[PDB]
Symmetry: C7
Subunit: 256 residues, 7 copies
């Protein structure tokens, strides 16, 4: 049984192959990390060399035990293929992960809308991103989904814009409405005066004349400015005699 | 018929091959489980070696009965392909399974919304997850569908937030409304006082001034806090003389 | 024409091959069925060996009539491919079939919602499942569709939960409403008293105060309990002086 | 030009091949049809042997005129592929055809809903099914679409169920309504008395108390039973003093 | 440079090949057309032989100028593939074309709904079908889209059915309404009397009792019959004292 | 280093190959354009010969520097594949381009609806088509999208059709309405009198009898004819005493 | 160990190969950029030569250490494939990037609607485009999504068109309305008088006669022209006695 020496040689090739593979791959993503590339991209590109070299090792090692070479390419091909399917979704998510962290279209702490759902971002991980909805629900979105959909980022821009729509009665003085609104926003310090300050009659409406006011503020103030400017419009408009109308209806009677 | 000895040799190769395959694969996912990896990924990765080794055995075993080698790669290729299709959905679900149990974006017992449907999670199994809708229906969702959709988790966060929207009549005292609401929530112990406590005039409405109140509580209290705070608002507002308005309408008569 | 003996040999190989194939395959899913596996997975896995072995037979049999071997892998490849396409939908449905019967996410006789349509399940067959809509329509849903969609099962859980929403007039006594509702459900024996028994003011509404009552019962009782508890609320509420309000409207007259 | 004899030999192989192919294939689906299989599956499976055998013939026939063998597998591969694409939709529809005729989830003459459209089935053909809408439009639905969608069959079940929803005024006697409805259905002979006979107060409604009546009848009677039982409810209810209410509205006047 | 004679031989093979190809293919779809098959399917199937034979010619012709054979299968494979993609949509549409003309699910001149859009068909061409909307817009629908969607054909059936829904006031005589409607349709000659003639109380409605009338007519008359029968119902009903009600409302006054 | 002469020979082959390729391809689409084919299809089909011939050149040229032949088919295969993906969308759009220009389902200047969006076409280019919305927005639609969706063309037909729906009060004379409308359209010269001229009572409506008028005009007149005919109906109807009704309501009073 | 000299030769080939590859590729997109092509297309096409040449180097280099050649094509094939998947989305976006910058269907600074979302474009980068919503949100859209959807460009056209719809009471003078509206727009200087100036009675409405006014202006003026022309209509219409009607209703009383 002197052809049972090839069994021993097969093992030798595998052990030497596994080590030679382990130390090239380590020694490649040592190189990549020392350039800059990206911790994850390195590990990935590296782990392909690793699994590649032990793929060669398996071919030549089995080959000394008469395993026809072109049957190893085939079996390993299938094996790889079956893994490939089972993972993929992952692979795709893994890649979106990288892109998201290395382009920061949103960063942790920004409030964003990631295709219908919106929340404050907590952390982008391997396959999935975590946000917290204003009210305290946690959402886990797959990195893949995020990257191939629109990313609406409420927070990256430093200055943002409220729009009020105020409806007043048709017999209200157009000039008076504009003046009160203009004098409310003029006096509010949190409204940026060097940017848009639109107060205008915008819509001849169903039962109300509709005025649009649009004014810019720092991103932090936007919420409080809205509320404070509203309370104000309501108070002033009442004290000044301007009526927010209820829904109207001309009814035309008929005794029958 | 001395070339009918290869038939016997073919069998020998298959039996030795089946055993050599069964014992390597067992002896591989002995190794993997002893590291840590994950019971399922072990069994799977293992069962690929297993079916791979008996794939080699079938090639060489049939090969000694003159089955052309490159016809076995082809027939088994097809066979594997036909299986592959029939399973897949399963393979994909099996993989999501792992991911879900080894990332616990939801754990058993959390209430979650898994893409339109929401219920309390019971158990994540091989291909499919089982939840129980608040009212007692059971839903069985495929692991695959779950993992590639958003996961809304109501329960992982320990503190959550009610939002009341209360509408009062236009001639109600703005300051009075804010004070009563503020004094209701101030006194409710279950409302976390070190977090958001927004009481504010939010919308000039159709037939009502709309106030928004937003207050945080432990996740367990959230439901009872809402109900208790509401009963309260209604009682106080009545005793204090504030009117929740019915829908309004100015009608403008015309005899014809 | 002594090379017209290969024609005779070609037939010999085919008949021997067809038989040797037919008796291995039978003798394989004899083995599988005796273990446990599953009658269909047996027949399927088996019928692959069968068609595989006669694939080898066709290669070697045609091969002795000078049919180039690597043209048989190709022609049969195409043939298989053309079948493969034509079937598939079936194969996919066949596989869902198995899964459904060997996981019983619903069993025959349970009422279920299989993605928009809901009925009582009758029987899961090879490719398609049959249910009967409460009113007598029959629906036939493809096993494939069912398995990759959510399965809502109304019947597997033994205890379920009604939710009543009752609207009363704003000037109704909050405490009185709660007591009558609570005393209706307290007395109903079919309501499980060791589970949730929520009676609460839930919504300040358009023209009604809305109370929510939620009570659990055995799955069988649920429908009758609802109807009986409702008739009751209506009767008691009337005799007790509580008004279910019609839609309201404050109209504000103007002679013109 | 003694190597221009191969041209003559090439033709010989083609003619003999075309005939040898035509007569095996005929002689195969002679065998299939004599078992039982199914006329189309026969013709189809058969026509694959046919086109397969002339595929071999073309390889060996061109091969004697120095056409490299592995170029014929390639060219015919492409040819087949181009056909394959152009047909497919057809192939898929052809297969659905079979399934539909050999499972009769609907048969000719049954009224069915085949994914949004519904009509009386006329005839299932090769690729497409023909139904006639109750009003006389003809619809032609592809067999493929049908088989991968739900099939709702109104007619296969022999007994079906009407549901009336009758709204009466709030001040109507609950017991009186139940009795009149119960006495209408009790006396209608076409209502199957050994099945469900539900008369019950179902919904406290907007401006009406809503009673639900559900009663089963033979499939033929269902339409006429509904109409007749309705005319009846209306007549009896009027003569008995029960009011079907118009939409209600409490209006709360304010001189301004 | 006696190995520059192969260049001249290469050309010879191409010219001879192009001609031999052009004359076989012509001489094949001469055969097909003479059987019956279909002018398009002929040209297509033919043009595959054509491009196939010049594919062989290119392999052997380049092959005598040392172009490695298995590089021509590869390059031409790619070329074909790149064409294949660019066309396809076309190929698919071309095939639908055939099917539509050779099954006439609609013919030119029939009014049809081809998935949301509906018009009178003008002409089915290579890739696209042209219809004219009742009002004069032209729509061009791809043959492919048409064939894989439902085909609603208004015109192939010779007799069709109008449905009137007439609403009358609740205090109208049920018997009187039925008689007038029945006597309108009885006298209209264009209504086919040997078919359905349903006049019935169908819906207890919001503010009207709703009668359904359904009557069949020739496809040409259907439009005019509807209009004429309607004018009639309105006239008779008025002269007979039956009221088409305006929307109703019971209002319940409250001085405040 | 006399085997470093092959490096020089490799270059020679590439330069001669690049030139021989550049001059055949030029000399092919010289031929195509001189027939008729189509400038783009020529350039495309041509540029495939071009890149094909330099593909052969690269195989044989690298081959004389010991680059294994079946590695060049493989590398270039990958290269081509990577390009293929990156382009495609383009290729598909490029093809739709041709089709659109060589079938003119719309031509520049026609107003068309290309799947939801509609505008006047300006120019169809390589990948994308440009239209101008009636109001001045510019839309750029991908040729690919256009060709696989319906094409609604408002302008190719020379004569089109307005439909007026006029509502008049229930107590209006049916004959009088028809006569005034008929006499309006009779006198309008821009209405084509040899085509449809439908004036008819069409709907017994909520609060109005609804008449439908449908009349055909040249495509240019259609817009002005509508406006002019409408102004007319309104004027005549008023002067003739016919009332366009406001929404109606029978109210049924109840003191409470 | 004189066969351990091939290990040294393997390295030599890789270093020489990496350099020879790096200098050809540099020297190719030196050529391309000097023509014109496009910076990105150059780098890409170039980087394919680069990775191609080191693919050849790896084959021959490993090949001198007995790595079977047809196993390197296979392993590298897999490696490339795994990369290919992980990237793709990127590749596709990268290509859209180019197209967008080299066709400028929108340029930085134009306001555009890119499939549901609209904002002012800031910058088109490698994979993703950035726009700023009128109100200050930032949106990041993938280049791929953009290019396969419609591109609506509000700004590339220099002149655009407002459409007012004004509703007046039914008893208003048709001629008077037209004259006032015409005289408002006649006098507005910002309205382009050499283009459309439509003032017309457009819709006989629910409770209002609806006039349509359509007038063209420079793109900059469009917003202010609308607002100014509206304020105007409202003022003039009031001073001239024309009424913008509230919603109407004929009520038909009934004591009960």
């Amino acid at each position: 049984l002197s052809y049972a020496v090839n069994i021993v040689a097969a093992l030798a090739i595998i052990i030497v192959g596994l080590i030679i593979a382990r130390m090239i791959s380590n020694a490649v993503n040592r190189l990549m990390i020392s350039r800059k590339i990206d911790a994850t991209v390195a590990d990935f590109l590296s782990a392909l060399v690793r699994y590649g070299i032990i793929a060669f090792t398996l071919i030549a090692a089995l080959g000394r035990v008469g395993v026809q070479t072109a049957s190893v390419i085939a079996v390993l091909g299938a094996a790889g293929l079956v893994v490939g399917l089972a993972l993929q979704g992952s692979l795709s998510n893994l890649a979106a992960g990288v892109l998201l962290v290395m382009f920061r279209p949103f960063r942790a702490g920004e409030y964003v809308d990631l295709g219908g759902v919106a929340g404050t971002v907590l952390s982008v991980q391997i396959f999935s991103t975590t946000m917290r909805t204003a009210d305290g629900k946690i959402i886990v979105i797959p990195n893949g989904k995020i990257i191939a959909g629109n990313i609406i980022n409420f927070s990256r821009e430093p200055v943002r814009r409220n729009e009020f729509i105020i409806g007043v009665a048709y017999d209200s003085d157009i000039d008076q409405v504009k003046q009160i609104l203009t004098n409310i926003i003029q006096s509010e310090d949190r409204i940026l005066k060097d940017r848009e300050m639109t107060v205008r009659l915008n819509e001849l409406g169903a039962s109300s004349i509709n005025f649009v006011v649009r004014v810019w503020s720092n991103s932090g103030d936007l919420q409080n400015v809205y509320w404070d400017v509203l309370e104000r419009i309501k108070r002033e408009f009442d004290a000044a005699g301007i009526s927010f109308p209820y829904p109207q209806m001309d009814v035309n009677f008929k005794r029958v």
